[PDB]
Amino acid sequence: VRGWVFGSTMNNKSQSVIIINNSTNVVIRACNFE
Amino acid sequence: NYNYKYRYLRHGKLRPFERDISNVPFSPDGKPCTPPALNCYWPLNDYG
């Protein structure tokens, strides 16, 4: 288990930092929604 | 040329380098409006 969700006021209302490792190659995005 | 707007309504001050983006109409006590309801503005204005 390695997944990380951060933000405020979910479901298409504000940005969100997400941290998910992709085979020891850590993918980190900061704009996704729901 | 009114392509440049500003936000002027928020519950509370900002933190340093806090970034506010979301566009929801305002009411001073929670309670989400729907314009043209009374005392429910838009959270943006133009420069002039």
From Swiss-Prot, chain A:
It comes from the Viruses. Glycans are attached at N12, N21, N22. Changing N21S: In strain: Isolate Shanghai LY. Attaches the virion to the cell membrane by interacting with host receptor, initiating the infection. Binding to human ACE2 and CLEC4M/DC-SIGNR receptors and internalization of the virus into the endosomes of the host cell induces conformational changes in the S glycoprotein. Proteolysis by cathepsin CTSL may unmask the fusion peptide of S2 and activate membrane fusion within endosomes. This is Spike protein S1. It comes from Severe acute respiratory syndrome coronavirus. The chain holds residues 98 to 131 of 1255 of the full protein.
